């Protein structure tokens, strides 16, 4: 599901799927070598 970007929560947590009782973030960035 592409969305171009330049609030977000309403159309994506009521019309799409469930809530999120945890939220992990992996910060790597576009490093092609890992």
């Amino acid at each position: 599901k592409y969305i171009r970007l330049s609030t977000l929560y309403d159309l994506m947590t009521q019309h799409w799927h469930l809530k999120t009782p945890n939220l992990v973030i992996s910060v790597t960035g576009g490093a092609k070598n890992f």
Partner: protein, 50 residues
Amino acid sequence: NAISFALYKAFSTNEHDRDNWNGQLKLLLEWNQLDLASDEIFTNDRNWES
């Protein structure tokens, strides 16, 4: 583990193999240096493309 560790040091300090990192890999592949190649070649601060 002593010859290849010594031969790599005289190769690495020529200051012309930063672009020629591919020479240091075939050197460490001609010998068997896993721990040296995984720490000093494949350590992501150098720019390779895989």
